[PDB]
Amino acid sequence: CKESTKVLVKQAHNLNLGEYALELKSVQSDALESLQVEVEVQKNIGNMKNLPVSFSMDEIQARKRYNTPFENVRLEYYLLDQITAFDLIIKTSFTKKNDQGTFGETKKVRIQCYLQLSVSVEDIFKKDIFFFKFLLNSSVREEPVILYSS
Numbered sequence: 640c641k642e643s644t645k646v647l648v649k650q651a652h653n654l655n656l657g658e659y660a661l662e663l664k665s666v667q668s669d670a671l672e673s674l675q676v677e678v679e680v681q682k683n684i685g686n687m688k689n690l691p692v693s694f695s696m697d698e699i700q701a702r703k704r705y706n707t708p709f710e711n712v713r714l715e716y717y718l719l720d721q722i723t724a725f726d727l728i729i730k731t732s733f734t735k736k737n738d739q740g741t742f743g744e745t746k747k748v749r750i751q752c753y754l755q756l757s758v759s760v761e762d763i764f765k766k767d768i769f770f771f772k773f774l775l776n777s778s779v780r781e782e783p784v785i786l787y788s789s
Contacts, residue, residue: 660743661687661733663750672698672752674729675716684711685736689729697724698752719752726751756784 661678678684688708691697696704698719707717719727732744761772777784 659684659735659737661731663689663729663731663748665750665752670754671718673716673718674698674750674752675714676712676731677714678712680713681735681737683737685734686710687712687731687733687735689731692728692730692747695722697722697727725753754778756786 659679659681661676663674663676665674667675678687686708687710688706690706691699691704698721699705700707700718700720709715726749728747728749730745730747732742732746734742734744755778757776757778759774759776761774763770763772773789775786775789
């Protein structure tokens with residue numbers, strides 16, 4: 640037992656690719672808050688859970704807080720709930736079981752839950768011809784937004 644006050648701190652850094660894993664983003668949504676996930680398929684996948692982690696439960700798929708484990712999921716979404724939250728913390732753990740035993744647990748990825756742009760609508764009414772006025776804006780007042788199509 641070489642346990643001591645040593646501050647060596649060996650890395651075992653994040654390897655890049657060419658093996659199965661799972662990632663969690665939040666894109667292509669409507670105007671109600673949600674979250675998503677995506678994974679790389681393999682020979683035999685297994686259970687893969689998640690959790691929130693704070694003093695109070697920020698977002699919850701159930702009535703109270705939840706975990707929402709699932710078995711053999713490739714690309715599917717998951718909803719959330721309400722608090723004064725901007726960026727929640729999700730500790731996704733994935734027992735892959737591709738081999739006899741293989742895991743990639745405790746991937747504490749802090750996902751973000753906010754609308755990027757902001758839209759306001761003004762309607763003007765002529766005699767049976769109708770025009771829209773669309774006042775677009777950015778939600779946060781530090782980072783700007785770019786655009787591709789509307």
